Every structure is written in structure tokens, then in C-alpha cells.
């Protein structure tokens, strides 16, 4: 059974000063922290074991999914019984969230290495927590990470989620080289390299690396022999030269909340459809 | 020299689950927590001393204005020199932020009482931290709290900020009785009562209490003997104060944001977003398209 | 390779008020928190992976073994290079400490359950962190937990550590029933029950459970089916284990310190203090100037 | 009324590794943190408003004196009501503890400067929290800080607490020069200088600065302009105003030192209200 490794040790300098004293993983998209969406997506894909690679400053992430004793007591002695029920059920009872401290800010590959002791010599999932997959645009129990797991476990081919971006934008992202295949949503095709921010004329595709990975167990020795130049990207490049890696075409839409503007867009997008405030918020937005 | 008392102990249940493990005072309006706007408003009005009446779960509030040692080191190391200069300047060098624990959620009046040791036998300011005064609609160095302070200095009359609301919504609010006189924005006038959630046709005005106060030192002994109401209510202590000296309503200029409620927070997010100093142009065009 | 599960969620009401706002695991025996002694015992026995079953209030435990960034920078700036090197070596580079939250104060059996997903369907170690095994009275590389392991590695019978107490004291502890067989130090024998705080006339031995376990994987389904009372006790589950396969009591060597008990904690402070590597000489001389 | 300024921002390098992730102020002397003895000493001397000058890592100090919600509920549900009553009494009901962050480890005098907003243009108390005054050797409602206060009220002279150390130890301490006056316990006298760690021969007395002060308001402008050491601004106060040494009665415990912390533990252990006799008997046999 695949565990999801989630690096949550970054200090979030791109969202300052909001993140000066609260984790970037706890920024609310309307009324829910980023990390709750990530954990929900995990649960929907069938993952029951989540490994947080974390930081001394990030206690609030674990508190969010743990019992908040004084909060429940207050909810009880105010008979907010539906609210109490939801709070108690943020984390499903069969989901175990475990945490290990990174120790030093040594990059995403080092972060993954911190999780080796929980994962073992096994394949695993990596989810970058600043990117949300919008579950109003895809059934996350059947698509995206769920389908990547299925494809990985049927074929043994590592799966790296990609999404098309407009050809003018290829310079912002890591770009998959799929050899000019007409890759359609939900499909997988062999990927030979990821190019880090190419020109519009150096770009091998319009497929941008999203931040979801299902990684074969053979990445582990590569990751250990990976220079301090420590980048998960580089060990992945090392994995391609010995076994096939596939790009997986994301379905629906995603939100990069690692970026102030992307986060603001996600806030409004989730807000218009909010279960209790969506109608009033939408109407007010139109009158503006 | 007036200190600003800011109650920040509430567990923020209207904003759950976002506030389950972070303070409501730290919810970001775009890229700045609510409490940072509150403190900026203080600074604009020349207040230099801020008293937080807080709670064991609210360390992040104090951490936001204190030196963040490892963050500053990371910004240095990565030579993000402009960012490092910005976070160092979140709290002006001449501003002091003090903290006392409330201990139990016994009401706004009790929260204010917890600050008495730091205020002393002196007048003081109360700001409720979930309400923002939009500084694109008013110059907070001269209007609102700044003007409330100037008026209080001139007269010794406590100032209670009010703002007009549609006559059909008055029951949601504390509502000021000012003897049915005309009150213009930025002006103060005698207030003889606050009615807690009046009916539509019983309401003595459409002037709703906003959550900004400049209060006379004489409220202290009144607050100290204010009975449970099951909370010690600041409004009850102010009622006592009106029985022995004049209290005035002050007419807010500009607009306010009630971020204690999910919808109001969401509106504030967008409203500050469209004029954001780096993202506003792109965000506005995105909203339009 | 066995992992060590360490329950650290309890509020430690026996050490109040010291433990009102710091974990009982962080109470210092001289100059070192209890938990650091526990991890060093782990390291001595070759354990490399340690699982903390914890609570929202216990961040200091994890902070202690993690990088303390501002403190390292302050030790550098004040040219305290020996101290800097020392706190950087509190957790060996080959040791991983991972943490799970227990969620509800539902007993030691539930705490152990909380670690199930990290142990897997494997044997594992439990260590109660309020009990120290004194490494001036035994070599923890070869004795006690390390000997329990090598035994389990050979027998596959679960190992529960016990130590003999005076007859006058058996009513304070949980007593093991090894059935008339008399147990020697460093030795293991078959065991059939534990009796909580028995009378003298019902005491099946003088062998008190210490708080170290090497447990077979077959305890896992039994743990999952143990009933409450509203706490799930690990003992009730070891009971069920002592039917599918044999469970053995291990006779601790040397001496232990029960630091969950105020007086026991105070005694440990003095005992480690007289031999402290830098203060023990002066502390000893000061102690004997008093007294005499 | 005098407020007590307690600097609690230091990272306690001398008690490592115990203090790596917990405040030195929370080190337990038997079963109570250092800081709880300090607060008890304040309340006994009649001080009811305490100013902690603190650090982001020191939340546990405020939590000790605040309501511990889950812990109180656990005690209630387990009907350990005697214990519940006792932890509800750690902070007297009329004692207010306030906190301000130091921000940069700029020294003890800077730390006092952080408390000016709270203190005002007023005299005030400083208490160094690693030093305990043993209340089995002195009635702290009538001696020591209490009497230091009464003396300051009558005179307007700042009071520096001092105690006789072995003449051979004088290099570890700040030493009060009392101008060849032979101070007796409980008495004050003028201080002609305060020397930092003098030689045995150069030392002007065997009276060492303890870590309790009652300071006149006039140190405030002096504190603001200081090259950042409290004793330098103390030195400047004496350049314009008389400052007095006050002879401590009883004994004190310097728990900023490892050995001092161990000695305090044992000394308080032997007189512990429920474990003292068992511990004392057992200690007798351990050497």
C-alpha cells in the first residue's frame, strides 16, 4: 500500500507576510487550509498513510488534524452539534498522519529522503502541498492521483502528473519531453526528460509538471547517490536512464497556491461555489 | 498617552475549520493577517502601545510582530533583501506590543479588565480585531480613531464609533440613541443609550456600534463592579458611565469590513485584492475575464 | 529491524506542578531530559527508528532531537564550540524519530495501536519513557533491551521485562506469574499472567513488570480486539497473546529508576548527580559536607 | 505600586542540554519550576503586577500561570479535586502577569528597557529568575525584597541586593564597594562603585550582587542612552544619585549554574512537604 509523502517544511517566503508566523500549508482557501484539501485528495485516492516532512514551526498542521480539545469543549457547551461533528471528522478514523522533521532546508529530494524510514524499500507518492486539484472539475476518487496509482500498479511505470499550459507560458514551469505525442486528459505516455523553464522555442511540449508523483522503489538508491546540486528532479532524471517514466495528463483544473495571485484566484473560485456562502458571494461579486 | 486594548482570545468558531489550529486574528486578507491591519490602524492614529488580551493558543499573533529569527536568516542567506527589510519593519521601532492572558472567556468587559494593570488609572482605546477600517476609504492618520482621540482630548467625553446601516438590519447590532439628532461623518454627538439588538421600529437610530472606543478612565471602577450579564459586558459598563458623565457617538468615515463572519471576510479578501500593490492589476483583469 | 514505540501522550499528573506546561518526558535528570536517556538506551540496543505516540502539548520532545536553529546560531556567536557540537549530536545521524498523535487518552494499548501503520505486520519494541535503565549498573549494548531482542530473535517468544521487588512492596506494582519457576538475572522463562497490585497471599511472584517489551507481530490482531473499561490496556492484549504462543518474562539486570513517581525522580536526580561527568565530584563533596 | 520586571529571554546555554527545548525558567526544583518560586517571592513582598521580558520560545512560562484547559478537565473527570484546586492556585487571583518580547538578545539592560511602556516614569523592581531566595531561611513577606522596598520608600535610594561570598570566590561575581563600611544582614549602606569580577586582592568587599534590585525612576533616561548593560546604567545612576547595597538575609540559590541547580534540588528535596522525610532518610545512606 502506497504512502503519500508530503513536504511541509518550507517557510513560505512567497506568501509573506501572511506566512511569517503561520505555515503556508495553513493558508485558508475560503474556510479550509490548503493542507486539508491535500489530505482530502489523498483520502479520495485511497491512501491511508500520510508522511509529513516537517519543521519545528509547523505544529499547526498536525493540530489541524488532531483532537482540538478546548475547541470541542466549547462547541459542546454551545450545542453546535453539527459543527462539532465536522471538526471531529476532519481526519477519517482510518487515516494515520505521521510526521518526521527535515532537520535542514536541503531541498525536495532531501525531504523525500527523510521519509525513507517510513516508506522502506517501496514505491511511494509525493504531493506538493501548495497545489490543489479542484474536485469540482474531476472526481478525485477515480481521476488524477487515483488513476496514476492504478497505472503505476498495473505497469510499474513511474507516473508524473502534467497539465497543458498555453505555449506562451512554458518558461514558468518544468516542461515534460514526451516526444511530441498528442497526450489527452487522463492518458499516460513515456517521458524522456523534464526541461527547467525553456524558451518558447526550447520547449519540448506544452505539458507542465504539476506536483504529483507516483515513484518506483528504484528511485531510492538514485536519490541517495544524488549530488548537492539535493534535487528530486535530478534523481528522477537518473531514473529515466534505467527504466521508463510516464507523464500523466491531469484532468480538470488545478490551483497553484504557492503564488500570491494563484492563491487569490483559488480563494475566489472556491468562494463562488461555497456550500453556505457561495450564492451571496457570487451575487455580490457581480454587482461589483 | 493612550494605550490600545485589543481582545484577541476568542476561538473563532464562525470561521471554522480554518481557525481550528490558527488564530482568527491571523486569517490573511490577501497576504496580511487581520491583526496586522489593526496594528497599522493604531500606528496611523499615533498609538505606540498595544495590549493584547490573548489565549494560550495565540502565540502566532505575538510571533508575527516579534523577530522571526530563522525566517530572517533564510531571507539573508537567499539574499531576498527587500523581503527581509519588509518583515523587519512589520512593527515600527517605537511601537510596543504587550500581552496578558484572559484565562477564561468571560466577556469583552472581562477582557478589558485584564488590561487594567497595563493601562492604570488612565483613559484608553479598545479595538475589536475582527473589524477592519478600510484605509482606501479614509485617512486613518486624521479620520476615525485619530479623530476620536482628538475629540476625546478636547472634551474628556468617551467616544464610541458608530456607522449607519439599513434600517431593516438594525436588529443585528448594538444601536446608539443620540436623541434623533443629525450626525454627519466625522462628527460626534451625545449618546444616551446603546440598545442591544433593538426591533426595527423600536430602534432609536440607524447608528450601529462599529467596534472602536476611546474610553474615559472613570469606566474602570464601573467595569470592576459590572455583574455577569453569562458574560461581563462592556456595554453594561458604558451604560453605567452614561449615568455619571457624557458619552458621545462618533460617525465613522469610509467603510468597514466585518471579518468575524465568513462572508464579510470573503468580501474583504476580494476588495483588498483588486487594489493589492503587486497583484491588484492582474487579479482585477482576471475577475473581469 | 525492530522499531521502538514510545508512548509520550500522558499529562504526567504525578509530577505536578512541574509538568503543568512542560512534558514529563522533558523533566531533567540533572541536565538531560528523561526522553534523551530513553533514546540513548534505544541507540545502545541498535534501534534506528523510534516512533513517538504523542500529544499537541509535547512539541518540546521533538524540538529536543531536531535542529534548534536559533540556539545553534547563538552558540556560534558566543564561540561555544564544544557545546554546539554536543547539542548537534543528541540524536545520531542514523536515527529517525517519527511522531503520531494519539488523539484520545485511551490507554497504553491504544497508544501502541496508533503506531500500527508505521510498524506494519512486524514485531516491535515498547518502552515506557518514565522508567530509566541505569547504564552505570548494566551495559545496555548487551543487557536488558539488547538481550531481550537477541532472545526474541532466537525464540520468537515475546519478552516482557521484570525485576524482583521486596515482598514488602509487591502490592505497589503489576506482578508476573511465571508458575513457581524461579527466575535468575538476565534469564527468560514462560509467563502466564500479570496481576495488578496483588495482595501478598495472591502474589504469584515478586517479579514486577518494568516497562520494556519486545512484542511479536501476532499481538496486532489481539490489540485490535481488546476491550475497554474507557481505556484499552496493553496488558489485556498480552493476556490474549499468552494463548496462541508463549510469552516470556525477562529478568532485568542492574537497576531501574521509576521517574513517573516524584520520589523516584528525586532519587534518580541524586544518583545520576553524584556521578555526573563534570559536576559529580563537587556535588559529591557538597553532599558529604552536609550529612557529616 | 511597584511592578516587578523579570528578564526571561535568555536561552540558558549553561544548563544544556536540559534547556535545549524548554526554558531555563521552567527547570524544576523538585516539583516546581524556578519561575514559580520567583512569582511566589513577588507576591510575598506584596508585588501583584509582574512583567516578563521574553522570547518566542518561552510560551511554557506563561502557560504555567495561565489556565491549562485540558489538564483541568482531566483532573475534574478523574475527580483528583485536591490537585485541581492546587493547580488553580499557582497564580494568585490578584496577580497579573504581563509579557513583552525582547526581540534581540541585546543584554539585560535592554531587556529592562523593553518594560518601560508598562512601568512608566516610575520606580520598579528587577528580579533575575535564575536566583532563588530560600523562604525556609527568611520570611519573604518581611525580609529581603520586602524590606528593600520599605527602605526605598523611606529614602528614594535604589537598593542593590548583595550577600557575603567566600573572599576567595570574589572573581565570579559583581562586587559591591561599600566604602569600608561593614554591612550587617538586613541593613543598607551607600555603594561607591560596583566592580565586575575583580581579583581576590583588588576586590573592595566580599559582598556580591545577588540579582534583586529596587531602581529609582531616574535610571530610565540613563538606560535609554547606554553604550547594553544594566550595571553600566546602574554605574551612571551612581554618578548622579546615591545607590545603596542591601545585605540579604537567609540563603540564596544560583540556579543559573548546573551545580547550583543540583544543590537547590537536593536542599528543597530534603524539606519537601510530602517526600522530604523519605528522601532525607534515603539520602543519608547514599554516600
CA distance A4 to chain D (A): 29
Distances (CA, A) of B57 to A6, A150, B10, B24, D63: 25, 42, 10, 11, 10
| CB C260, CB C24: distance < 8 Å | yes
Q: How far apart are CA B90 and CA A257, in angstroms?
A: 23
Give C69's contacts in chain B (Cβ within 8 Å). 69-70, 73
Residue among B164, B229, B234 at smallest CA distance from B203: B164
β-pairing, C124-127 with C4-7?
parallel
Q: How far apart are CA B24 and CA B15, in angstroms?
A: 7
Q: How far apart are CA D88 and CA D86, in angstroms?
A: 5
| CB C252, CB C163: distance < 8 Å | yes
| CB C167, CB C175: distance < 8 Å | no
| CB C207, CB C192: distance < 8 Å | no
Q: How many CB pairs under 8 A join A and D?
A: 7
B13: left (phi over 0), alpha (psi -120 to 50) or beta: alpha
Q: How many CB pairs under 8 A join C and D?
A: 147
Q: Suggest the residue from B68, B70, B77 to mutate for an interface test with chain C (most C CBs closer than 10 A).
A: B70
Dihedral sign of CA atoms D216, D217, D222, D226 in order = positive
Task: Output helix, strand, coil percentages for chain C, rounded to the nearest 5.
Answer: 40, 20, 40
Q: How far apart are CA D188 and CA D154, in angstroms?
A: 12
Angle at the Cα of A218 (from A212 to A220), degrees rounded to 5?
Answer: 80
CA B151 to chain centroid: 18
Q: Rounded to a whole number, what is the largest CA-CA distance in chain A?
A: 64
| CB D110, CB D5: distance < 8 Å | no
| CB C158, CB C218: distance < 8 Å | no
Distances (CA, A) of B136 to B208, B251, B270: 21, 17, 14
To the nearest 10°, report the CA torsion of D194, D200, D202, D208.
10
Q: How far apart are CA A252 and CA A273, in angstroms?
A: 16
CA distance D22 to chain C (A): 7
Q: How far apart are CA C66 and CA C239, in angstroms?
A: 37
Residues in Cβ contact with B60 at an 8 Å cutoff, skipping those fewer than 6 apart: A21, A22, A60, B22, B23, B26
Cis peptide before B17 (omega within 30 of 0): yes
Instruction: Dump the DSSP string for C39-94.
Output: HHHHHHTT--EEEEEE-TT-HHHHHHHS--HHHHHHHHHTT-HHHHHHHHTSS-TT
Cis peptide before C17 (omega within 30 of 0): yes
| CB D249, CB D144: distance < 8 Å | yes
Q: How far apart are CA D209 and CA D151, in angstroms?
A: 18
| B223 phi and psi angles, rounded to 5 deg | -60, -40
Burial (CB count within 10 angstroms: exposed 0-12, middle 13-18, buried 19+), residue A192 = middle
Query: Looking at C168-246, which runs of residues are DSSP E strands?
Result: 174-177, 188-191, 193-196, 207-215
Give A69's contacts in chain D (Cβ within 8 Å). 69-70, 73
Distances (CA, A) of A35 to B68, B80, C1: 23, 26, 33
Q: How far apart are CA C247 and CA C241, in angstroms?
A: 7
CATH 3.40.50.1950 assigned to domain B1-289? The reply is no
DSSP state of C259: T
Gap positions in chain D, given as the residue before each gap (C–N > 2.5 A)? 227
Q: How far apart are CA B18 and CA B24, in angstroms?
A: 8
**Crossing angle between the packed helical segments C262-274 and D276-284, to the nearest 10 degrees:** 30
- The architecture that CATH gives domain A1-288 is Alpha-Beta Complex (3.90)
Which of A20, A71, A284 is facing B20, going by the closest CB pair? Answer: A71
Instruction: Indicate the SS3 state at residue B150.
Output: helix
Residues in Cβ contact with B242 at an 8 Å cutoff, skipping those fewer than 6 apart: B191, B192, B193
Q: Do C70 and D57 touch (CB under 8 A)?
A: yes
To the nearest 10°, report the CA torsion of B68, B69, B74, B76.
100
Q: How was it solved?
A: X-ray
Provide the grid cell at B138.
479614509
Q: How far apart are CA B52 and CA B36, in angstroms?
A: 13
Fold of D1-287: Spore Coat Polysaccharide Biosynthesis Protein SpsA; Chain A (3.90.550)
Nearest CA in chain D to A21: D56
| CB D21, CB D59: distance < 8 Å | no
Question: Any idea where the domains of chain A sit in the sequence?
Answer: 1-288
Residue entry with cell 511554557: D60
CA distance A121 to chain B (A): 33
Q: How far apart are CA D133 and CA B107, in angstroms?
A: 39
Q: How far apart are CA C23 and CA C11, in angstroms?
A: 7
Q: Suggest the residue from C22, C59, C69, C72 to mutate for an interface test with chain B (most B CBs closer than 10 A).
A: C69
| D194 phi and psi angles, rounded to 5 deg | -130, 115
| CB B42, CB B94: distance < 8 Å | no
Q: How far apart are CA B47 and CA B43, in angstroms?
A: 5
Q: Do B96 and D114 touch (CB under 8 A)?
A: yes
Q: How far apart are CA B145 and CA B41, in angstroms?
A: 8
| CB D72, CB D81: distance < 8 Å | no
**Crossing angle between the packed helical segments B262-274 and B280-288, to the nearest 10 degrees:** 110
Burial C64-98 (b: 16+ CB within 10 A, else e): bbbbbbbbeebbeeeebeebbeebeebbeeebbbb
Distances (CA, A) of A178 to A146, A215, C222, D88: 22, 18, 51, 67
Burial (CB count within 10 angstroms: exposed 0-12, middle 13-18, buried 19+), residue B19 = buried
Residue among B108, B8, B111, B93 at smallest CA distance from B43: B93
Residue among C268, B176, B194 at smallest CA distance from D279: C268
Distances (CA, A) of B273 to A167, A287, C186, D3, D133: 28, 17, 70, 45, 57
CA distance C84 to chain D (A): 10
| D244 phi and psi angles, rounded to 5 deg | -115, 140
| B184 phi and psi angles, rounded to 5 deg | -95, 155
Q: How far apart are CA A123 and CA A158, in angstroms?
A: 9
Give C22's contacts in chain D (Cβ within 8 Å). 22, 26, 33, 60
Provide the grid cell at C277.
561527568
| C197 phi and psi angles, rounded to 5 deg | 50, 60
Distances (CA, A) of D177 to D162, D199, D245: 11, 13, 9
Q: What are B190's strand-pairing partners? A: B248
User: How many Cβ atoms are within 10 Å of C290's Cβ, its own excluded?
Assistant: 13
| CB D53, CB D102: distance < 8 Å | yes
Instruction: Indicate the SS3 state at residue C235.
Output: helix
To the nearest 10°, report the CA torsion of C184, C188, C189, C192.
120
Q: How far apart are CA B109 and CA B107, in angstroms?
A: 5
Q: How far apart are CA D88 and CA D66, in angstroms?
A: 9
| CB B194, CB B209: distance < 8 Å | yes
CA C241 to chain centroid: 21
DSSP state of B253: -
Q: Tell me, letter by letter, the H, E, C secondary structure of chain A.
A: CCCEEEECCCCCHHHCCHHHCCCHHHCEECCEEHHHHHHHHHHHCCCCEEEEEECCCCHHHHHHHCCCHHHHHHHHCCCCHHHHHHHHCCCCCCCEEEEEECCCCCHHHHHHHHCHHHHCCCCEEEECCCEEECCCCCCCCCCCHHHHHHHHHHHCCEEEEEEECCHHHCCCCEEEECCCCCCCCCCEEEECEEEECCCCCCCCCCEEEEEEEEECCCHHHHHHCCCCCCCHHHHHHHHHCCCCEEEEECCCCEEECCCHHHHHHHHHHHHHCCCCCHHHHHHHHHHC
Instruction: Indicate the SS3 state at residue B127.
Output: strand
| CB C205, CB C224: distance < 8 Å | no
| CB B156, CB B35: distance < 8 Å | no
| D272 phi and psi angles, rounded to 5 deg | -55, 140
Experimental resolution (Å): 2.2
| CB C106, CB C231: distance < 8 Å | yes
Burial (CB count within 10 angstroms: exposed 0-12, middle 13-18, buried 19+), residue D241 = middle
For chain A, the residue count is: 288
CATH 3.90.550.10 assigned to domain C1-292? The reply is yes
Q: How far apart are CA C27 and CA C99, in angstroms?
A: 19
B62, containing H or E segment: helix B59-65
Residues in Cβ contact with C30 at an 8 Å cutoff, skipping those fewer than 6 apart: C269, C272, C273, C276, C279, D18, D258, D262
Q: How far apart are CA A283 and CA A286, in angstroms?
A: 5
Q: How far apart are CA D138 and CA D155, in angstroms?
A: 23
Instruction: Indicate the SS3 state at residue C163.
Output: strand
Angle at the Cα of A202 (from A200 to A208), degrees rounded to 5?
Answer: 70
Which of C63, C98, C101 is facing A117, going by the closest CB pair? Answer: C98
Q: What are A101's strand-pairing partners? A: A54
| CB C20, CB C267: distance < 8 Å | no
Q: How far apart are CA C234 and CA C214, in angstroms?
A: 13
Q: Tell me, letter by letter, the H, E, C secondary structure of chain D.
A: CCCEEEECCCCCHHHCCHHHCCCHHHCEECCEEHHHHHHHHHHHCCCCEEEEEECCCCHHHHHHHCCCHHHHHHHHHCCCHHHHHHHCCCCCCCCEEEEEECCCCCCHHHHHHCCHHHHCCCCEEEECCCEEECCCCCCCCCCCHHHHHHHHHHHCCEEEEEEECCHHHHHHCEEEECCCCCCCCCCEEECCEEEECCCCCCCCCCEEEEEEEEECCCHHHHHHCCCCCHHHHHHHHHCCCCEEEEECCCCEEECCCHHHHHHHHHHHHHCCCCCHHHHHHHHHCCC
B194, containing H or E segment: strand B193-196
| CB D234, CB D160: distance < 8 Å | yes
| CB D209, CB D162: distance < 8 Å | yes
Q: Do B96 and D104 touch (CB under 8 A)?
A: no
Cis peptide before B195 (omega within 30 of 0): no
Burial (CB count within 10 angstroms: exposed 0-12, middle 13-18, buried 19+), residue B172 = exposed
Q: What spatial distance separates the first Cα and last Cα of chain B, rounded to whole Å?
A: 50
Distances (CA, A) of A118 to A115, A245, C123: 6, 24, 15
Give B63's contacts in chain D (Cβ within 8 Å). 56
Q: Rounded to a whole number, what is the largest CA-CA distance in chain C?
A: 64
Q: Please, which chains are in contact with C (at least 3 CB pairs closer than 8 A)?
A: A, B, D
Instruction: Dump the DSSP string for C5-42.
Output: EEE-----GGGTTTTSSS-GGG-EETTEEHHHHHHHHH
User: How many Cβ atoms are within 10 Å of B26's Cβ, its own excluded?
Assistant: 27
Q: Suggest the residue from C2, C63, C101, C116 to mutate for an interface test with chain A (most A CBs closer than 10 A).
A: C101
Q: What are C257's strand-pairing partners? A: C132
Amino acid at each position: 500500500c502506497l504512502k503519500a509523502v508530503i513536504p511541509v517544511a518550507g517557510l513560505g517566503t512567497r506568501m509573506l507576510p501572511a506566512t511569517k508566523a503561520i505555515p503556508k500549508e495553513m493558508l485558508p482557501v475560503v474556510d479550509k487550509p490548503l493542507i486539508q484539501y491535500i489530505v482530502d485528495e489523498c483520502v479520495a485516492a485511497g491512501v491511508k498513510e500520510i508522511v509529513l516532512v516537517s519543521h519545528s514551526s509547523k505544529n499547526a498542521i498536525e493540530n489541524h488534524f488532531d483532537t482540538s480539545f478546548e475547541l470541542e469543549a466549547a462547541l459542546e457547551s454551545r450545542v453546535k452539534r453539527q459543527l462539532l461533528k465536522e471538526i471531529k471528522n476532519i481526519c477519517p478514523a482510518d487515516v494515520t498522519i505521521m510526521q518526521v522533521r527535515q532537520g535542514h532546508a536541503k531541498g525536495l529530494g532531501h525531504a523525500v529522503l527523510c521519509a525513507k524510514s517510513m516508506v522502506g524499500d517501496n514505491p511511494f507518492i509525493v504531493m506538493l502541498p501548495d497545489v490543489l486539484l479542484d474536485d469540482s472539475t474531476a472526481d478525485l476518487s477515480k481521476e488524477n492521483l487515483a488513476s496514476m496509482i492504478k497505472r503505476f500498479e498495473e505497469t510499474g511505470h513511474s507516473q508524473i502528473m502534467v497539465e497543458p499550459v498555453p505555449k506562451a507560458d512554458v518558461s514558468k514551469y518544468g516542461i515534460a519531453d514526451c516526444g511530441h505525442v498528442a497526450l489527452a486528459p487522463g492518458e499516460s505516455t513515456l517521458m524522456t526528460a523534464v526541461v527547467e523553464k525553456p524558451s518558447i522555442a526550447e520547449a519540448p511540449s506544452n505539458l507542465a509538471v504539476v506536483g504529483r508523483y507516483v515513484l518506483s522503489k528504484n528511485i531510492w538508491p538514485l536519490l541517495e547517490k544524488t549530488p548537492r546540486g539535493i534535487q528530486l528532479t535530478d534523481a528522477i532524471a537518473m531514473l529515466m536512464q534505467q527504466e521508463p517514466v510516464e507523464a500523466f495528463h491531469m484532468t480538470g483544473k488545478s490551483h497553484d497556491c504557492g503564488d500570491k495571485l494563484g492563491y487569490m484566484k483559488a480563494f475566489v473560485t472556491y468562494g463562488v461555489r461555497h456550500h453556505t456562502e457561495g450564492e451571496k458571494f457570487t451575487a455580490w461579486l457581480k454587482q461589483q
